Design a protein around this ligand. Structure first.
Ligand SMILES: [Cl-]
Ligand code: NA
Length: 129
């Protein structure tokens, strides 16, 4: 599913991401925009053989099991395919664990390079939340 900007903002808010670990909603929407272009079905292979999945591009090296990333962890205890669902619940629950991991949202390269320090509130402007 390809979310609309405000549709995703509302879904994320409902799932408790607004201000989760101190990150306002705009940060999460911005991260999703640049990581997957709001597409829940996005996948991208990494050079180490792991693959990023879903709207937040969660990595199989540590957070989910895809059966093809030797010596990887499954810290979120879910098959990576669960992260591609039109229902973002799994992605959000796993993202909460990732952002609590110690490096905050810096875990998302696109957030660090394209959202961090920018006017992230603009990502939720105009939305009825
Ligand atoms: Cl932090
Ligand atoms: Na894994």
């Amino acid at each position: 599913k390809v979310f609309g900007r405000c549709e995703l903002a509302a879904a994320m808010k409902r799932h408790g991401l607004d201000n989760y670990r101190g990150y306002s909603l705009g940060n999460w929407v911005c991260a999703a925009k640049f990581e997957s272009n709001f597409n829940t079905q996005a996948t991208n292979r990494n050079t180490d053989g792991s693959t990023d999945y879903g709207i937040l591009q969660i990595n199989s090296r540590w957070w989910c099991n895809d059966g093809r990333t030797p010596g990887s962890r499954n810290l979120c205890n879910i098959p990576c395919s669960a992260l591609l669902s039109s229902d973002i619940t799994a992605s959000v629950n796993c993202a909460k664990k990732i952002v609590s991991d110690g490096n905050g949202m810096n875990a998302w390269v696109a957030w660090r390079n394209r959202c961090k320090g920018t006017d992230v509130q603009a990502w939720i402007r105009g939305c009825r939340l």
